[PDB]
Amino acid sequence: MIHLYDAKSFAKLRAAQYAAFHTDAPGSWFDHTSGVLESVEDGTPVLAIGVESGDAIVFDKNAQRIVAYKEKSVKAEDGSVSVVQVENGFMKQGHRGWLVDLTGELVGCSPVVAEFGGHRYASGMVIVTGKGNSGKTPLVHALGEALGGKDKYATVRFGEPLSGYNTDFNVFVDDIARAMLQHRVIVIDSLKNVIISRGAFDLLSDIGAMAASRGCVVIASLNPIVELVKEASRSNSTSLVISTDVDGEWQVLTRTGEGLQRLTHTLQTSYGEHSVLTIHTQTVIKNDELESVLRRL
Amino acid sequence: MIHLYDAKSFAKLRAAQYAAFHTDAPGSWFDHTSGVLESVEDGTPVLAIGVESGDAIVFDKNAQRIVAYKEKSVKAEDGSVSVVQVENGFMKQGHRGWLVDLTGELVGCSPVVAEFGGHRYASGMVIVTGKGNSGKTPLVHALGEALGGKDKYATVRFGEPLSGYNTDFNVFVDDIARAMLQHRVIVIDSLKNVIISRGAFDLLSDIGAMAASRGCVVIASLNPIVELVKEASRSNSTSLVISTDVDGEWQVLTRTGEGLQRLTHTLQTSYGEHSVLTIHTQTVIKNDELESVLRRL
Amino acid sequence: MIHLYDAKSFAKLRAAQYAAFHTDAPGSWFDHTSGVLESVEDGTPVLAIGVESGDAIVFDKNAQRIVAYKEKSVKAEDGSVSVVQVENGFMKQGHRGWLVDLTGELVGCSPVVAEFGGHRYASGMVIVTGKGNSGKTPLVHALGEALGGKDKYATVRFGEPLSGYNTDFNVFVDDIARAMLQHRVIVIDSLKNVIGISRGAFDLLSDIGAMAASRGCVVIASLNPKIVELVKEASRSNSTSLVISTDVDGEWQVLTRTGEGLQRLTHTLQTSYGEHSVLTIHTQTVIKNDELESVLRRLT
Amino acid sequence: MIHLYDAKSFAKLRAAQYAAFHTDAPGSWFDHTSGVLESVEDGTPVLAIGVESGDAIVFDKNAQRIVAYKEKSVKAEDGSVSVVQVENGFMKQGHRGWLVDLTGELVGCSPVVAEFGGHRYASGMVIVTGKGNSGKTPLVHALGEALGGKDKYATVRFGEPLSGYNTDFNVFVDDIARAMLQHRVIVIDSLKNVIISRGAFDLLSDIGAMAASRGCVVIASLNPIVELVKEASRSNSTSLVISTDVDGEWQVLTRTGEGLQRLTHTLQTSYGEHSVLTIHTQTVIKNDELESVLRRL
Amino acid sequence: MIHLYDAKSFAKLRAAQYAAFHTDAPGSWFDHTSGVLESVEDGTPVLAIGVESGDAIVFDKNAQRIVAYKEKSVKAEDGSVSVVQVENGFMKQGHRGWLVDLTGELVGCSPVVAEFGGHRYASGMVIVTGKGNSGKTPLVHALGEALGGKDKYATVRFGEPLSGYNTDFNVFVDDIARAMLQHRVIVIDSLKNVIISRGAFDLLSDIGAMAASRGCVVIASLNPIVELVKEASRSNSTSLVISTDVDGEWQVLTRTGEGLQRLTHTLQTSYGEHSVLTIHTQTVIKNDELESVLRRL
Amino acid sequence: MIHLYDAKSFAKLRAAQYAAFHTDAPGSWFDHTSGVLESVEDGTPVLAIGVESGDAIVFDKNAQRIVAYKEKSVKAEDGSVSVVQVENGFMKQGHRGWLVDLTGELVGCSPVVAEFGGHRYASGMVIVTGKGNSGKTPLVHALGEALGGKDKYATVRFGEPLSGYNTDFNVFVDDIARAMLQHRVIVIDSLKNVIGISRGAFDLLSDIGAMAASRGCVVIASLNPKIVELVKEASRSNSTSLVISTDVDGEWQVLTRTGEGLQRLTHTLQTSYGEHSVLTIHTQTVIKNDELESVLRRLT
Ligand SMILES: O=c1ccn([C@@H]2O[C@H](COP(=O)(O)OP(=O)(O)OP(=O)(O)O)[C@@H](O)[C@H]2O)c(=O)[nH]1
Ligand SMILES: O=c1ccn([C@@H]2O[C@H](COP(=O)(O)OP(=O)(O)OP(=O)(O)O)[C@@H](O)[C@H]2O)c(=O)[nH]1
Ligand SMILES: O=c1ccn([C@@H]2O[C@H](COP(=O)(O)OP(=O)(O)OP(=O)(O)O)[C@@H](O)[C@H]2O)c(=O)[nH]1
Ligand SMILES: O=c1ccn([C@@H]2O[C@H](COP(=O)(O)OP(=O)(O)OP(=O)(O)O)[C@@H](O)[C@H]2O)c(=O)[nH]1
Ligand SMILES: O=c1ccn([C@@H]2O[C@H](COP(=O)(O)OP(=O)(O)OP(=O)(O)O)[C@@H](O)[C@H]2O)c(=O)[nH]1
Ligand SMILES: O=c1ccn([C@@H]2O[C@H](COP(=O)(O)OP(=O)(O)OP(=O)(O)O)[C@@H](O)[C@H]2O)c(=O)[nH]1
């Protein structure tokens, strides 16, 4: 919805956004939105996501697809009306994204998803990319385990020429929807085949906001069309993890919230048995330095 | 409609257009059009805006969407007939833009929306853009608060990978329509995802004229496809706010009206707590200097 | 229709075309076609113009849109049949352009629309363009007033981010149709969004010059310069005349196609601003194709 | 249809093709095909031509459009079956081009259309083009009158911003069809707007063969997308008339028949009153010289 | 169908493929497939070819088009089922190409079509192309007569601005189908207008295999979009005849079979009366030399 | 489906993936999936593959096409529901790929298909490509025979101008589906016309590697190099292994993805021709991403 501000309410918002990353208990936002989803009446649509054609499929709180849902309208606080209708397995009225309010007035956050190695990590979409010899697949799994912490991480597999990999985009969005509905830490391997269908364009534009609203992190590998990789990394990701000149070393660049500073830190990594990667255990980065990082792609 | 002029009536028009920016009380036009909208008979369509497909949705004076409206014709002063019909939630007959006359003979104005720091600002669309380290999001919010003055400004959020951000274009145009119907100062963060669908093309072509007719200002962030950013900044904006070589410094370029001089002034800014930006408190700019400014993108 | 010529009838045509620009009373063609339109029986379609989709809408002599019109055929002199039918507000049979004969055998003219400052100006479409600091909007209004003379000029506004500007293409073509049906001197500000492409926009660029020249009205259209080459081609091939800014501030070059197969003429305009940016225009030489291309190169 | 040859029948064909340009009385082929068309039973389709959409409209021998025609099949000499059906003003079955046989075994000719100034000119399509100051419109009319000889030439006007010019492609193809059905010498001013719709592509590919089969000449002005002008001039024209370095001077390049030599000669011209051009009163040209000529465009 | 091999059966296949070009009596394959076609039961579809739209038309053994054919299934040796159905003059079920088995296990051949001047020539598609002054049209007719030998060659004419030339693609594919059904040596003048519709793409991809399966040769002129000419010449042709630096001289490059060596030889030619060309009466060429030849286009 | 991991279960997966290439008996995965397919109830859809239009056709375990199949749902372990429905010969509900579970928890493998000349070879798709004089067609047949071992290899022929070659894409996908359903070693000659693009062709390039790796069969496809970059990306991202010609005639480099997140391995092949162009292949080192890109650069 739209929000109105004066100087005082705006300052309060920025303080709350800052807290949502810097001082909230890691993973608190995820637990909060889990409660909101759990409170939703049975059969109510909670999430719509685009399929390959640009139509949208709709899910309930238990990640079960809704095939039929009678037109139903809800008036928001700002006066806007949201309508939802599902017919023959597809959204007839509504919008892509969360169909229930997970955020309220607290918008524009990068809710802290986890803390690891003395660094806080944001929810939203994290694109893992770069050139050179440092492998992306081992990194995304290492990050998934690390941010998972006490919890297991969920793996969505797509579009690689290996056993058991789904290559159908419509199954992919079903997997992603279920993952975000049920898990705080999600790995996607890989985004190569989405990088173009209306569904693929929708996914790139929608997923970061979907994840940040939920308070889950989606860690997606993307091997570098090159300008679309750059723009997805620049504008569609909440955080970026990019390989450097030095083997095993990665740079993490985090958007900490709406209008807030982008932060950076470095990761050192090494391989153990069967290529299992281990990540070893604040500085601001400006826009010109950010573009300098993107040039390496 | 079409308008006829001789030398004397043309000179009168230019004098009135000049006054609409330079000497009218700031925000007076907005208050005038609010009165016009308030005088509209119950149920009457007042605004049509394009959705993603290129179809148009229609709103009444209270920013409520009209789903059904029997064909109704109105003869204008020049002899032209405007017809409006709405069926199944979509415009069947009519045009995009204001469906009631807010302007009359007084067309081609950039009605003054506010005065701040000794400078007058125009209604219409203001694109906030540029390269370098000066942040666009903090600027648009600072400008929104400043031009809001005694009034709160409205924030429309779109297409960023942060919590609570809508990423569905059809919700976006609903938000924008409501904002322009109800508020003098509007911030859009951001225009990145519109920059292509018929709806997106319609919005870029329509919004400046819609806002200027209302006397509201739409302050839109746009991070630089590059030629589309240049043309939107060159030809679709009433004013442009562009970052400079010096950190914190911005140049404001204002179209003051039809056939009138483009003016320029500079803004100095600084950050306080939680990245809240403060803007610190006539010279003509020619077309070649304007192009020189656009080259920096 | 098609026309047949031998040496003698061709020479006569060229003499008549030459006269239509050089010696006819300025604005005489417009008055003639006004009479033709006024003589048309009530309810008869006179003009069809393309909307955004590429369908065509149809107008009667009073610039009122025709919604329903039973199929009706007319056999021309060359043996061809023109059919007109309108159903549900759209042309079902017919063609874009004038649906009644305004011209007869006298085709390929640039009928003189006005004389100002010792120069004759052609009807048809005039594109006002160029680079540099000389403003196009003040020029089109100055030219509109000047060629209007004793008469007011009509202003069609389209696609600028200013108060009261229509930005819907289908309203735009309605405005243009009405303007050409009712006025000799017409200003369009601006053509930017038509060049910004729909079938309707393509139709308009291809149709408007011939429509205006047939009527004997002048359409003075501002156009600020893939896209640049379309501005060049519209200026090169879709305009009856071109007014282009020069190196010197306030100075413009007017390039006029005087008729079918006839010489393109050129002259210069000097201008200055008064109060509230009102521009005043201050008061024969042939230009060849290579010089014409040299002028178009400046649009880069 | 398909034709079978051995050495002896092939040599006979080449001799007949050579004669069709070099020794037949100028305009004889046109008179022959006029007789063939005149012999066609009343109401029979004789010519189909593409409209803008790529559908085809159909004409009888009197250049009257056929709106309804019951399916009718004709078996050719080679065993092939040609079917023709027209429904609701459009071809339902058939092909673009001549729907009756004007040529028989005598195919691949450039039938002589006229002789002027000691040079024979071919029927088919003649593209008049080039750069520089020599005007194309005066040339096409001068050539039309000259090749017309004792007969008037027909003028088809299209796509110029001058009084009485048709700009609707579907009227254009109607004009062209009627012209070719009724006249030996035809001028088109101009081909600029065809140079893209399916109809325009069809016309460029069809018109030369249509005209050569009839024995009429279509003299078309084409101002130079540039590569499409080159290919139309190279491959879609029976003859080319191109301006040179010297003002008033033109080069005529003629395909004299299937597998036969391309010939060249020069024209000198001058203007009289009201820009009426007068043309003042064998050498082979090879493919490399032909390409050299096309480079000048 | 699919075929299974071990070392011994593979070696046998390669020996048979080698023989099909090098040692079989010239034209023997054509006579064999004529027998196969003649043995087909009355009314049975034997050949399907794509029309402009990408639909397919269907022919019987007598080159008569089939308009209606009830669904009929045939189980192949590998277990696959081929179904054929024709409705309203178009293929409803089936595939493009030969609808009866002309080859059996003997696949991947370039069956010898003729011997002339001490050189064997392959069936399939021969593209005649190149730059320079050597004419393609006279060459294709000279080659047609020469390879025809005791038999007349068939000429398919398409897309040139000369008398009697068909320019409608759907008539073109009808001509080609009939030619391949009834004649061993076929000339196409020319392929310029096919070089894009689905039908044109189908034809370029299908014709070589169609011709090689039949044992007929299709000799097609193609004047050089340039990369499409290169790829058609590189990958869609069984043999290539390309002009050289020396006037009248041509290089013939022949694919002799699946996985077999490409051979080359040179032709010398001269003109007699009315431009009738006479061709005057083993060395391997590698891929790098082949690309060197293609660069000349 | 989605899979959940902690450190311990992830380490177990990587160990199992490593084993699936390095230590499992060659061809064991193929035999396992043959058993799974054989156990499927009569009439059950097992494989869906895209036709030219982007619709999908569906096959049973005997490689017979299914024309009609009533909607049928199956709930997976992760909670997801897979639905399959076939109407009028086309998939109405379902997904492209294997419609029965051949893999279970054991995903992301490159199951060893064969061992030859002291080297293990992966199932999945192998693209055979490169520039220079070394012929691709003889190589794919030599590799087919070699990896076939005791078994014959299947040859799918497509899009070459030679006798008996199918050139219809929909027949091609039928051939490929049958081949993967019935044979461990498959040769495709050639992929040129799929790269020559339809939705079906795009689907095939994106689907075939995963289909083959899931089955444990190897698809050995020749591909001769806008278009060049698509050959590079297909070779880079759509292939389980790559066999590319080198500077030296007869010599090839084999680059193998050994599994999800595992090392890419490389070795060289020497070859020579016998009679009638029959090629014979004569009888671990890791390759990094920068070296891999260096190899791909040679395709220009
Ligand atoms: O022990 C190992 C294993 C793997 N790797 C390296 O990590 C990579 C992980 O395996 P991938 O094949 O997934 O590579 P990637 O994610 O970097 O890029 P794509 O191929 O998916 O586009 C492998 O390509 C390998 O080079 C190591 O450096 N050490
Ligand atoms: O205290 C602060 C906070 C923020 N900033 C700067 O302001 C920017 C505002 O945050 P954004 O991430 O919105 O940057 P932006 O609007 O310029 O561009 P997008 O990424 O949205 O396209 C941040 O990127 C940061 O560099 C400061 O300079 N100081
Ligand atoms: O007094 C004046 C007023 C205006 N001008 C100049 O005339 C121009 C007329 O006003 P516009 O803003 O319309 O500029 P334009 O027509 O040249 O081009 P667009 O922006 O419409 O594409 C303005 O851009 C201004 O620079 C003057 O030179 N002096
Ligand atoms: O007496 C004359 C008349 C005309 N001309 C020249 O002949 C041309 C014929 O008039 P056009 O305007 O038709 O020029 P064109 O055919 O060469 O090219 P387009 O403008 O149609 O694209 C004119 O443009 C003029 O330059 C002369 O050289 N002498
Ligand atoms: O006696 C002759 C006749 C013809 N020729 C040459 O042979 C060519 C055959 O006539 P074409 O015009 O068909 O040339 P082409 O096939 O090479 O190319 P297209 O224009 O058809 O695309 C002619 O262009 C001519 O140059 C001779 O060298 N000597
Ligand atoms: O004995 C032989 C036979 C064949 N070859 C070489 O092997 C190649 C195999 O025959 P192909 O003609 O199939 O070549 P290719 O597979 O390399 O590429 P495409 O043409 O299919 O795109 C032939 O091109 C030939 O040069 C030899 O080097 N020696």
Author numbering:
A (entry chain A), B (entry chain B), D (entry chain A), E (entry chain B): 1 to 195, 207 to 235, 242 to 298, 313 to 328
C (entry chain C), F (entry chain C): 1 to 196, 207 to 235, 241 to 298, 313 to 329
Paper text:
The lipid-enveloped bacteriophages of the Cystoviridae family infect Gram-negative bacteria, mainly plant-pathogenic Pseudomonas species and share similarities with the members of the Reoviridae family, including bluetongue virus and rotavirus. Their genome of ∼14 kb consists of three dsRNA segments small (S), medium (M) and large (L), which are sequentially encapsidated as ssRNA precursors into the icosahedrally symmetric procapsid by the packaging NTPase P4 (15–23). P4 is a protein of ∼35 kDa, which can assemble into a hexameric ring.
Of the P4s, only ɸ12 is purine specific, with pyrimidines also being accepted by ɸ16, ɸ18 and ɸ13. A specific feature in ɸ12 P4 is a hydrogen bond between the hydroxyl of S292 and N7 of the purine ring. The substitution S292A did not prevent ATP binding but completely abolished ATPase activity owing to misplacement of the triphosphate moiety in the active site. A displacement is also seen when the AMPcPP bound wild-type structure is compared with that of UTP bound hexamer. Indeed, we find that UTP effectively competes with ATP and inhibits hydrolysis (data not shown). Hence, purine specificity is achieved by locking the base by hydrogen bonding to the N7 site of a purine.
